[PDB]
Amino acid sequence: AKKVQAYVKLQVAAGMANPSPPVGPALGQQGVNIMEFCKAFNAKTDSIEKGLPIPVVITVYADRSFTFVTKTPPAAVLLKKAAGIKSGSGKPNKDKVGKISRAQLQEIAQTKAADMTGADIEAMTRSIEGTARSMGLVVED
Amino acid sequence: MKVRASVKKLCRNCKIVKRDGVIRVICSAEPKHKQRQG
Amino acid sequence: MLQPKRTKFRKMHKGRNRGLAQGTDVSFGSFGLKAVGRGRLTARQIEAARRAMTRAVKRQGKIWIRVFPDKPITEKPLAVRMGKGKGNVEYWVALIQPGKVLYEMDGVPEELAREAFKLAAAKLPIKTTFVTKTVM
Amino acid sequence: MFTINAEVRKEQGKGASRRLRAANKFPAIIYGGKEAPLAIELDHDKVMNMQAKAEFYSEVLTIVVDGKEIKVKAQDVQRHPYKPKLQHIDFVRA
Amino acid sequence: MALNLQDKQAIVAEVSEVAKGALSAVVADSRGVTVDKMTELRKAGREAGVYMRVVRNTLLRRAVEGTPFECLKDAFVGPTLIAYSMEHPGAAARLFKEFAKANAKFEVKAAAFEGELIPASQIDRLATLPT
Amino acid sequence: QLQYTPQNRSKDNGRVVVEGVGNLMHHIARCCQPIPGDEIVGFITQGRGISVHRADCEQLAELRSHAPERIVDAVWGEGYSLVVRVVANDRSGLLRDITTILANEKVNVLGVASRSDTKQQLATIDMTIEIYNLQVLGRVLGKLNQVPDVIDARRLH
RNA sequence: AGCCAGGAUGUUGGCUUAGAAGCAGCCAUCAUUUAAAGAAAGCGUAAUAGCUCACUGGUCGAGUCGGCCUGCGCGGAAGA
């Protein structure tokens, strides 16, 4: 479809949406209906799970009309998810906060397996582990 | 333009030049860097 | 500054600065800023250097100061007729022979030592040269 | 592996020594074990580059002189007060 | 980069796969995009793990000293940039046409590879994708 | 002259609920100046009420070395007072810079036990305050931390 | 040395914050595809995006780049 003439990501959570302040400009500077953004973000997330920030590649075609494809929930999102945490380390790698057994780093990997570069799925996990470390987490896998 | 006794690069886009023997740090960026003497 | 507290005498002969100082080889730290030319150092110069050397590397790292002033230097009050007794020690100094390593440094990457020492050297009246701690 | 060429010194006076040092070569001495200590004039620069390496001040070294290869060690050195160049060397006839 | 044998870590790796090097195809990719071979190395990294891996290194000092082994027609393949078309899992197969898929998709183009005679076809896209 | 009802605030109690009961006369320990941070395991002194000693600290540990059975834990009930310290670069007003941020500060800045000395630029401040919520501090620290001269903002035990 | 291209993904790393998405500040700094691409060297925003470097792949056709010790100069240099 049309490339990127008004294409950016986003950071709301679950099916939740609507405001301009956090990311309304993503459409606010575009002109596309922010309420169409609400109901339609739910056109995908009417079934999508809570408090796990899922970005949507806005897809406003080279002629105003659009579509969109959310990313499967982010790795950082699925770490706030798998760790039993709500936020990242108070101070990186020098401390931990929540565990993520690698079967989950892999399941999340199989979420990204259709939404990220790869060949070695446990290697995708290696990315999710560096992700786990950078953000500082109980590294247990 | 500076005319002080030091003169040496003031970024990198600054450049050494020896016109008439006199050293002049020309700068293809900041006009200010331009100087002389050395 | 860095004047010596107490002394056997409050004044001292001008003296001579010939010779090559013993404080040569690096001792404590990882580098050092060995002296090159010859000359004397007012204590305040040492302080001007220490700061404009310390601040150069923030509080990280470590700095030894191999030399000490101690030599008194008098001066005749302004517009004073000759003789009439020795002047008054306005300030202290250190006779510096070539090779008398001054600020030995340690704890930081070599490039930084070159960085700071270049500065403090700028403060100093005598020419200088960076030096790396040596194996025997 | 470390190896140098050298010379039996002619005159050993401070003067001849000094100018010899000006001649890009400098006096060195070797002693130990038994032999009467031998004056060792030797080229500077080669030794200079050779010494930079820390190993030079610990390992066994081989010194040439008329074909003979004494295997001394670096016992000590006296450098120039404010210049990179050396000045004199002391060798334990390891 | 690194000494001769280290650049031979490269050339001997290449040649090691040249042993499987049957079908031949090349191109000077002085212009392309990360996205296409991102999806293509993703392709080799999907449909069959690792095959015809292309750690492109095209010197008239590499392909040339990588030529002696097999695909002798690589003698006139080295100057300018060079793509690596290598057979292994389904020899003399679509491995070429995959870059036809990339062809229509901004790599400038696969630029009509002359192809060589090891399996059969050259400049033309193969007509035998196994029954 | 800006110099405590907080001496009657512990009397207002609720600052502690030892092992499952409140009121208990206790107090801040000068060693680990506790605040509603990582717990507290108050020691029982023979007199003068409980000696709350934050939680985990040599003294709190050495009493273990003695007769530990005297020591017991405590939640917190419902966050008053604290002593804090920040290091700086000599002065030249870099202390006045603290004093400037001190001017910015809203909480009662009691003990202003400033210090520096050393052979140089090492400078400090033994400030004491009535800070409330734990989060409010880092904020001041952050406000202290805009000035790089404020080389080390932190609470001290 | 110039010129062509790429310069990514996890991911908008975390903490923080109104905001950090390379670049508020404090730390991680691995992993994936890797030809190669720093959880980013510079610019840049409200965060964005954008533009350029590192680095890597094409070209090209030979040395070339950075230091050291030194010989002679140059700049710094204005009076009745």
Give the 3-state DSSP-derived string for A104-134, with helices as H, strands as E and coil as C.
HHHHCHHHHCCCCCCCCHHHHHHHHHHHHHH
User: Is the Cα dihedral A24, A25, A26, A28 positive or negative?
Assistant: positive
Q: Is residue A62 part of a domain?
A: yes
Range of the structural domain that residue C64 is part of = 21-136
**Amino acid at site A71:** K
What number of other Cβ atoms are within 10 A of residue F105's Cβ?
17
Across the interface, whether the CB atoms of F121 and C54 are under 8 A apart is answered yes
**Whether A92 and A37 share a structural domain:** no
Task: With beta carbons less than 8 A apart as the criterion, state whether A53 and A12 touch.
Answer: yes
How far apart CA F123 and CA D12 sit, in angstroms, is 60
**What are the tokens at F38?**
């990582």
Q: Could you please state the CATH topology (level 3) that the domain comprising E1-130 is classified under.
A: Alpha-Beta Plaits (3.30.70)
Measured CA to C1', what is the nucleotide nearest A72? Answer: G10
Helix H or strand E segment including F134: helix F134-144
How far apart CA C54 and CA C112 sit, in angstroms, is 11
Nearest of C116, D14, D20, F122 to residue D6 by alpha carbon: D20
Backbone φ and ψ of D38, nearest 5°: -110, 130
Q: Which long-range contacts (CB under 8 A, 24 or more apart) does E41-46 make?
A: E41/A117, E42/A117, E42/A118, E42/A119, E43/E98, E44/A119, E45/A117, E45/A118, E45/A119, E46/A119
Backbone φ and ψ of B21, nearest 5°: 85, -35
CB contacts < 8 A, C to D, total 18
Backbone φ and ψ of B27, nearest 5°: -135, 115
Nearest of A84, A121, A112, A87 to residue A99 by alpha carbon: A84
Task: With beta carbons less than 8 A apart as the criterion, state whether F46 and F115 touch.
Answer: no
Point out which residues pair with C14 in neighbouring strands. none
Does the C-beta of A136 come within 7 A of strand G? yes
SS3 category, F22:
coil
Measured at the CA of A124, the angle between CA A121 and CA A125, to 5 degrees, comes to 95
Nearest to E50 among A117, A118, A119 (CB): A119
Number of domains chain C contains: 1
How far apart CA E86 and CA E116 sit, in angstroms, is 12
Task: With beta carbons less than 8 A apart as the criterion, state whether F122 and F87 touch.
Answer: yes
Pairing type for strands D28-31 and D38-43 reads antiparallel
How far apart CA A69 and CA A77 sit, in angstroms, is 17
**Amino acid at site E67:** T
What number of other Cβ atoms are within 10 A of residue E14's Cβ?
22
Q: Say which experimental method was used.
A: cryo-EM
C6, C7, C12, C18: CA torsion to nearest 10: -100
**What are the tokens at B2?**
């500076």
Nearest to C98 among D57, D76, D82 (CB): D82
Q: What DSSP designation does B20 have?
A: G
How far apart CA F62 and CA F73 sit, in angstroms, is 16
How far apart CA D68 and CA D3 sit, in angstroms, is 12
Which residues in chain E have their CB less than 8 angstroms from residue A117's CB? 38, 41-42, 45
User: Is the Cα dihedral E64, E70, E76, E82 positive or negative?
Assistant: negative
Task: With beta carbons less than 8 A apart as the criterion, state whether F36 and F74 touch.
Answer: no
Backbone φ and ψ of A37, nearest 5°: -70, -40
Pairing type for strands F109-115 and F122-129 reads antiparallel
Task: With beta carbons less than 8 A apart as the criterion, state whether A98 and A79 touch.
Answer: yes
How far apart CA A98 and CA A114 sit, in angstroms, is 26
Counting every residue written for chain E, the total comes to 131
Domain CATH for D28:
2.40.240.10
How far apart CA A80 and CA A104 sit, in angstroms, is 12
How far apart CA C120 and CA A23 sit, in angstroms, is 52
How far apart CA F85 and CA E114 sit, in angstroms, is 76
Across the interface, whether the CB atoms of C98 and D81 are under 8 A apart is answered yes
Task: With beta carbons less than 8 A apart as the criterion, state whether F102 and F110 touch.
Answer: no
E89–A contact, CB cutoff 8 A: no
Q: Is residue A2 part of a domain?
A: no
Across the interface, whether the CB atoms of F122 and C50 are under 8 A apart is answered no
**What are the tokens at A108?**
């999340």
Domain CATH for C35:
3.90.1170.10
Closest chain D C-alpha to C87 CA, distance in angstroms:
35
Q: Is residue C78 part of a domain?
A: yes
Backbone φ and ψ of C111, nearest 5°: -55, -40
How far apart CA C35 and CA C20 sit, in angstroms, is 11
How far apart CA F11 and CA E4 sit, in angstroms, is 82
Nearest of F93, F90, F50, F104 to residue F73 by alpha carbon: F50
How far apart CA A27 and CA A36 sit, in angstroms, is 10
What number of other Cβ atoms are within 10 A of residue C39's Cβ?
17
SS3 category, E19:
coil
Does the C-beta of D84 come within 7 A of strand G? yes
Which residues in chain D have their CB less than 8 angstroms from residue C21's CB? 81
**What are the tokens at A128?**
């999710």
Pairing type for strands D62-65 and D3-4 reads parallel
**Whether A62 and A78 share a structural domain:** no
Task: With beta carbons less than 8 A apart as the criterion, state whether B16 and B25 touch.
Answer: yes
Q: Tell which phi-psi region holds residue C87, choosing left (phi > 0), alpha (psi between -120 and 50) or beta.
A: beta
Point out which residues pair with C62 in neighbouring strands. C106
- Write the CA distances from C21 to C98, C100, E27, F139, integer angstroms: 6, 5, 70, 54
How far apart CA A30 and CA A110 sit, in angstroms, is 33
Which residues in chain D have their CB less than 8 angstroms from residue C136's CB? 57, 74, 76-77
Name chain C's partners: 3 or more CB pairs within 8 A.
D, F
**Whether A11 and A64 share a structural domain:** yes
SS3 category, C40:
strand
- Write the CA distances from C80 to C14, C72, C73, C76, C84, integer angstroms: 19, 20, 17, 6, 9
Task: With beta carbons less than 8 A apart as the criterion, state whether A76 and A13 touch.
Answer: no
What number of other Cβ atoms are within 10 A of residue C90's Cβ?
12
* Chain A residue at shortest CA distance from E44: A119
What number of other Cβ atoms are within 10 A of residue A66's Cβ?
20
Q: Which of A23, A41, A71 is the last residue of a domain?
A: A71
DSSP string, D13-71: -HHHHHHHHHTTEE-EEEE-SSS--EEEEEEHHHHHHHHHSGGGGTSB-EEEETTEEE-
The packing angle between helices F134-144 and F96-104, to 10°, is: 140
Across the interface, whether the CB atoms of D76 and C136 are under 8 A apart is answered yes
How far apart CA D58 and CA F76 sit, in angstroms, is 64
* Chain A residue at shortest CA distance from E34: A117
Q: Do chains F and C touch (3 or more CB pairs under 8 A)?
A: yes
Q: Is residue A81 part of a domain?
A: yes
Task: With beta carbons less than 8 A apart as the criterion, state whether F56 and F31 touch.
Answer: no
User: Is the Cα dihedral C115, C119, C122, C128 positive or negative?
Assistant: negative
Does the C-beta of E24 come within 7 A of strand G? no
**Mutating which of C34, C36, C134, C135 best tests the D interface, going by the most D Cβ atoms within 10 A?**
C135
Number of domains chain A contains: 2
Number of domains chain D contains: 1
How far apart CA D64 and CA F120 sit, in angstroms, is 55
Measured CA to C1', what is the nucleotide nearest E49? Answer: G33
Count CA within 13 A, CB hemisphere, residue D50.
Answer: 20
**Whether A15 and A52 share a structural domain:** yes
How far apart CA C104 and CA F112 sit, in angstroms, is 37
| C1' (G6) to CA (E82) span, angstroms | 15
**What are the tokens at F94?**
């870099």
Backbone φ and ψ of C34, nearest 5°: -60, 140
Backbone φ and ψ of E54, nearest 5°: -115, 85
Cβ neighbours of residue E113 closer than 8 Å, sequence gap 6 or more: E24, E25, E26, E27, E83, E85, E96, E123
| C1' (G70) to CA (C89) span, angstroms | 43
**Whether A32 and A61 share a structural domain:** yes
Backbone φ and ψ of C129, nearest 5°: -155, 135
Task: Please tell me what resolution, in angstroms, this structure has.
Answer: 4.1
Range of the structural domain that residue D8 is part of = 1-94
Across the interface, whether the CB atoms of F121 and C55 are under 8 A apart is answered yes
Chain E 33-52, CB < 7 Å to strand G: 33-35, 37-38, 41-42, 44-45, 50
User: Is the Cα dihedral E33, E37, E38, E40 positive or negative?
Assistant: positive
**Amino acid at site E21:** G
Tokens 């400033």 belong to F114
| C1' (G66) to CA (F136) span, angstroms | 53
How far apart CA F68 and CA F62 sit, in angstroms, is 8
SS3 category, C62:
strand
Range of the structural domain that residue A54 is part of = 7-71
How far apart CA A117 and CA E44 sit, in angstroms, is 11
**What are the tokens at C103?**
């600020």
How far apart CA F80 and CA F35 sit, in angstroms, is 7
Domain CATH for A59:
3.30.1550.10
Q: What DSSP designation does F115 have?
A: E
Strands (DSSP E) found in chain F: 43-44, 50-51, 82-89, 109-115, 122-129, 150-155
Across the interface, whether the CB atoms of A119 and E38 are under 8 A apart is answered no
How far apart CA E36 and CA E39 sit, in angstroms, is 5
What is the radius of gyration, based on Cα positions, of chain D? 12
